[PDB]
Design a protein around this ligand. Structure first.
Ligand code: NAD
Ligand code: NAD
Ligand code: ZN
Ligand code: ZN
Ligand code: ZN
Ligand code: ZN
Lengths: 374, 374
C-alpha cells in the first residue's frame, strides 16, 4: 500500500495571487523522521486562506493553502510517538514544540516554531513534501489542508477522539477555537459585562459564543452586512448594529449605548480602522480590546496614545490563546460532551472539487463556514 | 484668623507658555460647600508640570500649576467630613468621587470627575478660587499646589498620618505612587522576570523600585543621560544602557540581551517613538508593555498591529492604577513603616521662591526630584 511510498493525489494549488485555485495532481512524499502523513477528511475555508490569495497575508507562492482541518493518519515517520496510523487528528497551524520559551511559559501559545511570523512555507527541516509539474510547492503554516494527503511535523498535529465527527470538528482547528479562546481565555470576559464584536463571520460568531459562555450580559454585534445579524443573535448576540445606518461614527454610538463604553471589544475583521475603533469604544479607564483580525501585510495603523494612558488594555492573540497540542484534544472532548455547538457556523458543505465556489460564497457574504469534503 | 476670609499670598502663576513662573500675589477665596482650603508645606516638581509650560500638556492659561504636594488643612467648607483643620493631607490630581462608573469598578482609578481628559482648569463647580491683578486664574488638575494656599474639592484630598514628614511623602502625591503602582499594580511584575524601563527620572526610578519589590530578577534601565545610571543601579537596576552607544536600534539590543525579549517594559518618558520601542522589545507572545509617559497633545503614533497579534499586551495608566483616596493614606503608612524609601528620589530642596531654578535643574538633567518648601 501507500506507507513509505510517494502518493499521487489532487490538491488545490495557488500559483499566483488573485487567481483561482487550480485543482491539480501532486506527488506527496512520505513522512520523514518525526513527520506524519495525513489523509484529509474535511477542511474549512477560513478568511485567512483568502488573505493569501488577495496578497493580504504574504507567504511564499506557489503554495497549497488550507489550515482548518481534520483527517486520519496514513503513516508516521521514524520517531513519532504521539499518533499512530488510523488515528483521527487535527493539524495545528500554530505548533507546540514544548521546548521553546513560549511553550514553557504558562500563558504564551505562539510557539517559536511557527511559520506565520516569517513565512518560509516549508517543513521544519526547510524542505517541501509537495511536487506538481516537477515544481516544488510550498506548504502553508506547516499544514496545507487543501490536499487529499498532507505531511506535517509531529509538533503540528494533535490526536483527537476516535468517535469525532470530523466534518464538524475540523472547525476547532481555527475559526471556533480562535473566537472562543479570544473571549474566555484572552480577554477574560466577566459575567455581567458588556461586549462588542466587530465582524460576524465564523470567528466573530465564535467570539459571541465565548462571551455568552463567559456570562456577558450584553453582546453587541457590529457588521456592515445586515444578513449576518440573524445568526449572530441566534448564537448569543443581544443586539446587532450596522455602521452605515448611522450619521455619526460607530464608536460614538457604542459609547452612548453602553453608557460610556463597553467592557470588552473584539476586532474580528482585519482592518486598521476597525482595530482603532474597537479600542476606542471600550471604557477608557478599564476596558479591554482584543485584536483577532489579521491586518494587511506591511501596513501601520495610526492612534492616539492617550486612548491607552487613561487605562485601556489592548491585546492581540493567535489561535485564541490556546496551547494548540494541549487544548485541541480537550475542545473536541468538550464538543463531544455537548458543551458547545458547531453547526450554526457551518452554512455550506461542498465537495473539495468545488473549492473555488466555496471561496466565492465567502467573498460575497453568503456564507459563514463552508466545509470542503474530500 | 483666616477662616471664611479671602487670603492674599504668593503663588507661581504661569501667564504664557514657555515663560518663567511669576511669583506674585493672588487672592484665595474661602472654600465653598465640600471644598477644603490647604496651606502648602512642600511641593515636588514633576515633569508633567513642565509639560504645561512647554504646551505638551494643554490646560487653560493663565494657571497655577503644581500637583504633587503635601500641606495642612486651614479651613473646610460646609459638609466636609473626611478632613478637619489641622490635618496633614495630600491633594489628589486624580479624584475619587466614589459614585461614578470608574470608582465603583474594582480595577479602575481614572475618576470621571478628573480634569485631565477635558481640562477646564476650574473647580468641580466650574468656578475659580484664584485672582491675580483682578484677573481670574485657572486651577490645574483641581490641585494647583504651586501656591502658599489652594482650595480643593473634598474628592481631591486625602488625609494622611498626623506624624508624616510632608517634605518627603509629598512625592507620594504623584511621582512615587505612579511609578511604583505601574510595576506592581498595573503591569503586575512577576517574581523572576526581566524588566526594561525607558526613562530614569523620578517616575522611572520609582518604577524600578516597584519591579524590585515584585521580585524582578533583571531590570534594565534605558536613558540617553548616562548620569542617571548610578542612581538607577542604586535603586534596583541590574544594568543600564544608553541607546546612543549602539549602532543598532535599542529594541534589537534589548531583545538580544533578554534572549528574545523582556517580560515587562515601561515607557516613562512621554515620547511617541519610545512608546513603540518599548512595546517592541517585550517578548512577542507574552510580553507586557505599560505606557506611563504623557504624550504630546493630539499627536498620534504609528505602529504595526502584528506587534500585538502575536500575543503582546499594551496598556497605559494614570497614577499607577491607584484609587487615589483609598491608596494615598495606606502608601503613607507603609512609608512610615519603612516598606520603601523616598530619599533616593530627592536630589535638591529649594524654597518655593526658587521655583524657576528648580525647573532649570529638571531641564538640564541635573535633578531627579526637587522639593520646594514654603
Ligand atoms: N488571530 C487568529 O488566530 C485568527 C484566526 C482565524 C482567523 N483570523 C482572522 O480573523 C478575521 C476573521 O475571519 P473570519 O473567517 O471570521 O472572516 P469572515 O470574512 O467570515 O468575516 C468577516 C466579517 O467582517 C465583516 N466586515 C467587513 N468589513 C467590516 C467593516 N468595515 N465594518 C464592520 N464589519 C465588517 C464582514 O461582513 C464579515 O461578516 C480574518 O482577518 C482572519 O484572517 C485570525
Ligand atoms: N501616567 C501618569 O499618571 C504620570 C504621572 C507622573 C508623571 N508622568 C509622566 O512620566 C514622564 C516622566 O516623568 P519624570 O517626572 O520621571 O520625568 P523626567 O524628566 O525626570 O525623566 C525623563 C527621563 O527620560 C529621559 N529621556 C529623554 N529622552 C529619552 C530618550 N529619547 N530615550 C531614553 N530616555 C530618554 C530623560 O533623560 C530623563 O532621565 C513624563 O512624561 C510625565 O509627564 C505620568
Ligand atoms: Zn484561520
Ligand atoms: Zn514551542
Ligand atoms: Zn506628575
Ligand atoms: Zn469617580
Amino acid at each position: 500500500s501507500t506507507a513509505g511510498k510517494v502518493i499521487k493525489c489532487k490538491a488545490a494549488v495557488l500559483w499566483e495571487e488573485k487567481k483561482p485555485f487550480s485543482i491539480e495532481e501532486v506527488e506527496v512524499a512520505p513522512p520523514k523522521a518525526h513527520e506524519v502523513r495525513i489523509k484529509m477528511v474535511a477542511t474549512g475555508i477560513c478568511r485567512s486562506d483568502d488573505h493569501v490569495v488577495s496578497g493580504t497575508l504574504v507567504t511564499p507562492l506557489p503554495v497549497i493553502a488550507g489550515h482548518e482541518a481534520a483527517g486520519i493518519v496514513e503513516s508516521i515517520g521514524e520517531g513519532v510517538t504521539t499518533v499512530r496510523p488510523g488515528d483521527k487528528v487535527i493539524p495545528l497551524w500554530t505548533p507546540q514544540c514544548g521546548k521553546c520559551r513560549v511553550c514553557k511559559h504558562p500563558e504564551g501559545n505562539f510557539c517559536l516554531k511557527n511559520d506565520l511570523s516569517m513565512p518560509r512555507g516549508t517543513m521544519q527541516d526547510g524542505t517541501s513534501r509537495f511536487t506538481c509539474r516537477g515544481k516544488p510547492i510550498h506548504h502553508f503554516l506547516g499544514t496545507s489542508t487543501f490536499s487529499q494527503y498532507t505531511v506535517v511535523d509531529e509538533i503540528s498535529v494533535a490526536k483527537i477522539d476516535a468517535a469525532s465527527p470530523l466534518e464538524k470538528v475540523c472547525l476547532i482547528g481555527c475559526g471556533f477555537s480562535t473566537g472562543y479562546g479570544s473571549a474566555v481565555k484572552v480577554a477574560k470576559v466577566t459575567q455581567g459585562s458588556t461586549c462588542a464584536v466587530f465582524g460576524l463571520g465564523g470567528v466573530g460568531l465564535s467570539v459571541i459564543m465565548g462571551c455568552k459562555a463567559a456570562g456577558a450580559a450584553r453582546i453587541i454585534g457590529v457588521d456592515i452586512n445586515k444578513d449576518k445579524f440573524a445568526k449572530a443573535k441566534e448564537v448569543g448576540a443581544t443586539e446587532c448594529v450596522n455602521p452605515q445606518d448611522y450619521k455619526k461614527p460607530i464608536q460614538e454610538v457604542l459609547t452612548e449605548m453602553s453608557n460610556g463604553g463597553v467592557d470588552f471589544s473584539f476586532e474580528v475583521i482585519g482592518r486598521l480602522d476597525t482595530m482603532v475603533t474597537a479600542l476606542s469604544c471600550c471604557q477608557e479607564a478599564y476596558g479591554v480590546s482584543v485584536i483577532v483580525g489579521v491586518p494587511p501585510d506591511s501596513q501601520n495603523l495610526s492612534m492616539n496614545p492617550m486612548l491607552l494612558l487613561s487605562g485601556r488594555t489592548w491585546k492581540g492573540a493567535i489561535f485564541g490563546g490556546f496551547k494548540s497540542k494541549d487544548s485541541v484534544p480537550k475542545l473536541v472532548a468538550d464538543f463531544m460532551a455537548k458543551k458547545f455547538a458547531l453547526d450554526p457556523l457551518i452554512t455550506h458543505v461542498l465537495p473539495f472539487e468545488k473549492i473555488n465556489e466555496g471561496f466565492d460564497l465567502l467573498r460575497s457574504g453568503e456564507s459563514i463556514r463552508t466545509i470542503l469534503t474530500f
